Design a protein around this ligand. Structure first.
Ligand code: COI
Ligand code: COI
Ligand code: COI
Ligand code: FE2
Ligand code: FE2
Ligand code: FE2
Lengths: 273, 273, 273
């Protein structure tokens, strides 16, 4: 089997092309680059510049006003680890609501950036479901109108793990990002013309094991954008089916919700260790 | 903004003094020293000496008799990490009930030590609620008659994290303890005349985001007393409100309990990493 | 007290012999070697050879076909951590159903290997319950017809922790495995004639604190078989009783289930740190 990370045009997928190839990719690899999805280096420049300017020239008062009282990295500014937790790296997060913006121009640029990412993530997830003939409990659209989280970081840096999202979209700017493909770590360089997609555990779950959730990590001067498309707490699934594809669930009953499985706080990643 | 860790007299707070300053501290820093709360180096000496004597002269049989069958560090003696888990450090824990005491004198000294700590923690938490005009679901006293945990350790030693308590009271004896203040790690030396207070995530939650829960850590021959004031499993709060201040909750419904959020086992700290 | 790890014959236990010694072992140590349980180096050779052959000569296609879409190490092949997650070590897991076998001969050999392990684990757990006069809520057999997990690994390697199983059976092949006995790490060498047993937190819980769940770790060219006997999600227990023996539960009510306590996903180990 080719260990190459494939590339798919969203437009072409939406037209019913390369369905067999798409299915094989999802099953055997669970990751691919996506083009023609409305996201390129162009849309990124604007957001990167404005936020980077903030991480460098924003004062403490300005950062404080956009910092959550709890360091959860859910909304606003965060200094992630004498000195400051910023020494290692800084982060900016946002979602569909309850955001913290430092200025008007920043808000406009990022609200639009977030929207393109959300639209693209929903679109590719929609094709993931169609290619596997998957109809989530409660319908496709209700499943896709969910709880996304966008994190932008600015600098092994990150330990091996898999994501618990439906799908995760990544934009980057030495190749630090590595993913397991064909039983070996493969480089995942930047593609100014595309976004990198990682399938998460929820894709595996909802499709009944038809999609792989690949492990990946970061080796150790770069910025990355990570968009997690996460289901709603009440997303419902079959317990026996989860067991049939690898989930070591401790759930009584025939059906369960995302909340029942993961708990009352979103968990984005999981280390196999 | 001054990055100095302020000091407040409990007596003065209870009299309605420095309310504006207290509010600013809670919001911008989430930590402060507390005086006139009935806890000083005096009350500590007695407890420290008796337990330290145990950690050094107590036999294996004596330690075994006050050691829980599961190494949870909830009650009794614990050797925390050829050799012994004690090599790194030893710990002694207690709560309102189900305690394990090695002797009568030890019991008397520690029951009184625990009580002063619990009274002080409840008292400062009571002022935290009043300063922010917070009325917990079910009332103030029911909220404060909770599930505290006292841990005494004897020796980065501890990774950056924030506490999930309402408030945490610390007594100490090179400044190892560092906390993030104004975007920088600040030393938190010992004050024989006061107790150091850290606001936890529950303070942030119950007050609707009016209190910061500061991150902190320990850099690497000292003993420290840590008292966590923790809510009851049935403490209830508004889901939309939790989201409004940073909590990345995966909870269906308008209201939820501490148990719904954290799970069936108390979790005292959380690393932002 | 002797810090020696005792050995017990399953046959002799089932006949009512050494009951006082067994009780003392469970309470003070929580670990022991077990003989006459139907498991020796003989039964192991067959399974070890066939799987080891796979880890070395099996192609990527063959490994892929027995690899779960999510890297949970619940069923099938797993490469556990330029290179591959296999570099560190490889693993093969199985349970009562939903298994992934690479060949017919492999299936026969391992289905029988798993069965002997499950029978032995249930048998010793049955004696653990009888020696402590324990009658689980819902009866002994319903409690023992549970959710076991068998993991076979092929290479500190593993950090200090205790197991959350009822009991855990280990077969091994320099002594890497160390356990805390009498307040000191003790070697746990291989015994071709016996299986090593570790009591888990569930044994402590169901017996009301009569059984210790010992901490252990691995120091750093060997293979080990680990069989966790895990309760069903609906296993029910008394909340006040759990508190009486060390469990820091955040559970409202008088009774709770394993699922209520641990969550919707099995958790096999826990680090005291
Ligand atoms: C390598 C980056 C995309 C970070 C990542 O994988 C994550 O945040 O889950
Ligand atoms: C620095 C000590 C007070 C330990 C601590 O922060 C904790 O136990 O949460
Ligand atoms: C030392 C081995 C038996 C591994 C282990 O303890 C475990 O998997 O829980
Ligand atoms: Fe990831
Ligand atoms: Fe802390
Ligand atoms: Fe273990």
């Amino acid at each position: 089997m080719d260990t190459t990370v494939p590339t798919f045009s969203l437009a072409e997928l939406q037209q019913g092309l390369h369905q067999d190839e798409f299915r094989r990719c999802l099953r055997d690899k669970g990751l691919f680059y996506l083009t023609d999805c409305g996201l390129t280096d162009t849309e990124l420049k604007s957001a990167k510049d404005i936020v980077i300017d903030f991480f460098e020239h924003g004062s403490e008062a300005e950062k404080r006003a956009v910092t959550s009282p709890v360091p959860t990295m859910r909304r606003g500014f965060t200094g992630l680890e004498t000195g400051s937790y910023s020494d290692y790296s800084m982060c900016y997060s946002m979602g569909t609501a309850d955001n913290l913006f430092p200025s008007g121009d920043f808000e406009r640029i990022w609200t639009q950036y977030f929207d393109r990412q959300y639209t693209a993530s929903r679109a590719v997830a929609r094709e993931v479901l169609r290619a596997t003939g998957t109809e989530p409990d409660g319908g496709v659209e209700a499943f896709l109108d969910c709880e996304p989280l966008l994190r932008f970081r600015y600098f092994l840096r990150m330990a091996p793990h898999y994501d618990l999202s439906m799908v995760t979209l990544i934009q980057q700017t030495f190749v630090s990002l590595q993913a397991e493909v064909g039983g070996a770590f493969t480089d995942l360089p930047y593609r100014p013309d595309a976004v990198l997609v990682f399938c998460g555990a929820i894709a595996t779950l909802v499709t009944g094991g038809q999609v792989k959730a690949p492990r990946h990590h970061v080796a150790a001067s770069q910025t990355s954008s990570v968009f997690f498309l996460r289901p709603n707490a009440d997303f419902t699934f079959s317990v026996p089916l989860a067991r049939e594809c690898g989930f070591d669930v401790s759930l009584d009953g025939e059906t369960a919700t995302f909340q029942d499985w993961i708990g009352g706080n979103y968990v984005n990643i999981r280390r196999t260790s």
